[PDB]
Design a protein around this ligand. Structure first.
Ligand SMILES: *[C@@H]1O[C@H](CO)[C@@H](O[C@@H]2O[C@H](CO)[C@@H](O)[C@H](O)[C@H]2NC(C)=O)[C@H](O)[C@H]1NC(C)=O
Ligand SMILES: *[C@@H]1O[C@H](CO)[C@@H](O[C@@H]2O[C@H](CO)[C@@H](O)[C@H](O)[C@H]2NC(C)=O)[C@H](O)[C@H]1NC(C)=O
Ligand SMILES: *[C@@H]1O[C@H](CO)[C@@H](O[C@@H]2O[C@H](CO)[C@@H](O)[C@H](O)[C@H]2NC(C)=O)[C@H](O)[C@H]1NC(C)=O
Ligand SMILES: *[C@@H]1O[C@H](CO)[C@@H](O[C@@H]2O[C@H](CO)[C@@H](O)[C@H](O)[C@H]2NC(C)=O)[C@H](O)[C@H]1NC(C)=O
Ligand SMILES: CC(=O)N[C@@H]1[C@@H](O)[C@H](O)[C@@H](CO)O[C@H]1O
Ligand SMILES: *[C@@H]1O[C@H](CO)[C@@H](O)[C@H](O)[C@H]1NC(C)=O
Ligand SMILES: *[C@@H]1O[C@H](CO)[C@@H](O)[C@H](O)[C@H]1NC(C)=O
Ligand SMILES: *[C@@H]1O[C@H](CO)[C@@H](O)[C@H](O)[C@H]1NC(C)=O
Ligand SMILES: *[C@@H]1O[C@H](CO)[C@@H](O)[C@H](O)[C@H]1NC(C)=O
Ligand SMILES: *[C@@H]1O[C@H](CO)[C@@H](O)[C@H](O)[C@H]1NC(C)=O
Lengths: 128, 429, 98, 49, 49
């Protein structure tokens, strides 16, 4: 941004500063908020098992290791258009949707049992 | 020109195609209290715990709306659970469906008209992994992606068309049963009361009219701007509401300042509380207003989505007889297309034209007997009498195979004299 | 009214609505159900009733032999409607509630 | 606060009236401009007009 | 010092006010020619007066 020589700040629609001028070396710095988002826990019933997977919404995976932490070791970290998914492994088959994660992805609990994530299937194919 | 012995009958017809747009869903949104009100402040949070469970309730409400949206889409589009395909050879009797069938030369296999529709509407907040966009987002406001991507809805729509044109209305009741297309159309005329030999003798005419009507839809859509107002309104309203919510963070509500870090960096706690409390009250009221109006809009959209599901079941998978439910005229058939946040129906309909004048009568007295039409009506060409069907002028001689007898001819008001020809006697003649 | 409160007039006056209704009746009784699908095509009234019995599964024969009986019953029914309306008070509750 | 209460209740009533108006439009279109076969949609008995 | 409560209230009430006229238009404007009934009233014995 080209602060003119007489200017000092830059404000937001909600009256929050988002640029500034360093009072010693007169240069312009942008200010950006840190990352935030929800946390979704995906579970089969407690009657069936005590295992879970975790979804960090709208957050690129790298920043989860940056910031309980007994899962982020991973070995099965996966990046979906809905966020960063941890604790579930990716298969190549397509089934019908069981628990909806979003953006076309669902997850289920199956086989030595685990939690798998796949792309839902619309139905069988047929030619008249 | 009403009169008590005059009738008017059509002599030609016209095939009409028209469009209808319906909203189905809207944008899923999520808001976080403790960020919207007390951003990054522990004093404010401890002050907010004294209100109990307002914020849990707000989150539950918004989540309910968010789920209901996906339910809406599922009801409207998932009417079939096999993905039919159309054969490679396109001998459809002379009808041309090129502008509504899928097109492989695009990354998303959408047809021509679906591309026009997707370029007409200017959507925002797509929600996928990431301008007023970020200014909004920086305050606890997020947008979630829908469950069905835009490339799956297109598959559903192409399945519905392929089924409709290769099998008819049978795939909506059981297994799909094939049948040539021209014979399908003959059935669909017997549906509206026109004899079926009218199609086999005017087949090229009908095909040409259908093709031209599709062409006009195409250009009229490719030119005019305000076709899709109904969808744009939804988008606009959502954007506006969200914008005003963000603006309300600049107000004082009577404190010394609208910035929370200034109140915290000047005064000592026992006097900072008196000010922070005022800020909390104002902002909490702002959220409640937002959530209430969102609930009411969601109810409206649900009503519209149920209507669209009914039209899909009754106009596309069958042939409707309810008047003006699937267009103006006598319904023949319909085709679906998808548009951003909604659906578009193309209704194909039959409209008579070229009418003429005749004189009529209710019955015929022959030998002290009264003959009535089995199906049709008696008309006079000026000197002679004929029977015809009611929707298309096509006269025939009066015999004892297309009339039936009942009573003598002393009681009907307006009966006329003529002769009724017996088919067997000329064989015996 | 004297505290910021106002009432606006509707766009369609009460004579335009009456014109619309009279148009609908005239079309219905002179042409049948054809004016809702295209151009209006005329047809005598008795024959239109014969069609409308064929619509419910009764032969059209039945009407032409019983025409005066049917006409009389229709007229009497309309008469009862009007006087019953002219007598009882709470017919229109649904509107008064609004 | 009094104004906000007023406006909210008015919005809900308006929604109810809209539903009723859609029903009336359908009855005009199907009972008057045609002959209906849906049972009890246009009265009790077999519909004529 | 409260900002935009009043623009919101006026906006809501205006929305309702317009929707009313939309309702009436939908119900009654089903035709777009104004038919007339003939001067002679030979309707077969029925009486619509
Ligand atoms: C059937 O005949 C009637 C009566 O001749 C026609 O109605 C007349 O049409 C002319 C031309 O527009 C008018 O000047 C007369 O006023 C009409 N008569 C009445 C009573 O209104 C009618 O046009 C004819 N049908 C067709 C299809 O032409
Ligand atoms: C169906 O109609 C389309 C028109 O949209 C026809 O495709 C056009 O065919 C002409 C004939 O040479 C070409 O000049 C155009 O460039 C074509 N348009 C497009 C968009 O490809 C198509 O041929 C018709 N179907 C059949 C079987 O003829
Ligand atoms: C029914 O109407 C159609 C359409 O007007 C008539 O066919 C058209 O005739 C004109 C002149 O010959 C040309 O536009 C074409 O020959 C036809 N149009 C199309 C689109 O094919 C037809 O003649 C009319 N029916 C009768 C019996 O006259
Ligand atoms: C047709 O129109 C009306 C109804 O049949 C008749 O005029 C009046 O209608 C009332 C309706 O209750 C009846 O009491 C009478 O028939 C009439 N009242 C008076 C005071 O005259 C009219 O006579 C009927 N017949 C004709 C030829 O129009
Ligand atoms: C055999 C027979 O029915 N003849 C009568 C004839 O006498 C009468 O003039 C005519 C009037 O329409 O109706 C017929
Ligand atoms: C599941 O939990 C236990 C098994 O762990 C079983 O006894 C119980 O009946 C089950 N309850 C339900 C609701 O499935
Ligand atoms: C995630 O971040 C890495 C680097 O931080 C970047 O290379 C990658 O493109 C990002 N992916 C997404 C989906 O944001
Ligand atoms: C299996 O999945 C991997 C990525 O997970 C992909 O590269 C590969 O093409 C898939 N195999 C098949 C047959 O689809
Ligand atoms: C049709 O009417 C004319 C008189 O306008 C008549 O000459 C002709 O015979 C009639 N039709 C037939 C098939 O005779
Ligand atoms: C039709 O109107 C004429 C007019 O004079 C009349 O003579 C006749 O009885 C009426 N009814 C008919 C022709 O059935």
């Amino acid at each position: 941004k080209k602060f003119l020589p007489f200017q000092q700040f830059g404000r937001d629609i909600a009256d929050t500063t988002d640029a500034v001028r360093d009072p010693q070396t007169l240069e312009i710095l942008d200010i950006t908020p840190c990352s935030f988002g929800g946390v979704s826990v995906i579970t089969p019933g407690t009657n069936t098992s005590n295992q879970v997977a975790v979804l960090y919404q709208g957050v690129n995976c790298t920043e989860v290791p940056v910031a309980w932490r007994v899962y982020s070791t991973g070995s099965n970290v996966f990046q979906t258009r809905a966020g960063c998914l941890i604790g579930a492994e990716h298969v190549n088959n397509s089934y019908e949707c069981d628990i909806p994660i979003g953006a076309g992805i669902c997850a289920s609990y199956q086989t030595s049992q685990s939690i798998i994530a796949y792309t839902m299937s619309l139905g069988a194919e047929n030619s008249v | 020109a009403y009169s008590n012995n005059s009738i008017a009958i059509p002599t030609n017809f016209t095939i009409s195609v028209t469009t209808e747009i319906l909203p189905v869903s809207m944008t899923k949104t999520s808001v976080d209290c403790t960020m919207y009100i007390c951003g990054d402040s522990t004093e404010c949070s401890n002050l907010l715990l004294q209100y109990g469970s307002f914020c849990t309730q707000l989150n539950r409400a918004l989540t309910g709306i968010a789920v209901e949206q996906d339910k809406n889409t599922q009801e409207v589009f998932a009417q079939v659970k096999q993905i039919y395909k159309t054969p490679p050879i396109k001998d459809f009797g002379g009808f041309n469906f090129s502008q509504i069938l899928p097109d492989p030369s695009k990354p998303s296999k959408r047809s021509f008209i679906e591309d026009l529709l997707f370029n007409k509407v200017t959507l925002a907040d797509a929600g996928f992994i990431k301008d007023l966009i970020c200014a909004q987002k920086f305050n606890g406001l997020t947008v979630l992606p829908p469950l069905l991507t835009d490339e799956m809805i297109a598959q559903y729509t192409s399945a519905l068309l392929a089924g409709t044109i290769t099998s008819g209305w049978t795939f909506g009741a059981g297994a799909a049963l094939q049948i040539p297309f021209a014979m399908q159309m003959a059935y669909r005329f017997n549906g509206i009361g026109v004899t079926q030999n009218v199609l086999y003798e005017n087949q090229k005419l009908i095909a040409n009219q259908f093709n031209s009507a599709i062409g006009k839809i195409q250009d009229s859509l490719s030119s005019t701007a305000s076709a899709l107002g109904k969808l744009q309104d939804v988008v606009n309203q959502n954007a506006q509401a969200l914008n005003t919510l963000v603006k309300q963070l600049s107000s004082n509500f009577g404190a010394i300042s609208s910035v929370l870090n200034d109140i915290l960096s000047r005064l000592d706690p026992p006097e900072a509380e008196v000010q922070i409390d005022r800020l909390i009250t104002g902002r909490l009221q702002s959220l409640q207003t937002y959530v209430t109006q969102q609930l009411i809009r969601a109810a409206e959209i649900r009503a519209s989505a149920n209507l669209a599901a009914t039209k899909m079941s009754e106009c596309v998978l069958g042939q409707s007889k309810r008047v003006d439910f699937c267009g103006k005229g006598y319904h023949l058939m319909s085709f679906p297309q998808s548009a951003p946040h909604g659906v578009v129906f193309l209704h194909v309909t039959y409209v008579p034209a070229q009418e003429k004048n005749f004189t009529t009568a209710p019955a015929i007295c022959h030998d002290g007997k009264a003959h009535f039409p089995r199906e049709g009506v008696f008309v006079s060409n000026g000197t002679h009498w004929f029977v015809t069907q009611r929707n298309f002028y096509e006269p025939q001689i009066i015999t004892t195979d297309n009339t039936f007898v009942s009573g003598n001819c002393d009681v009907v008001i307006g009966i006329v004299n003529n002769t009724v020809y017996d088919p067997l006697q000329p064989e015996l003649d």
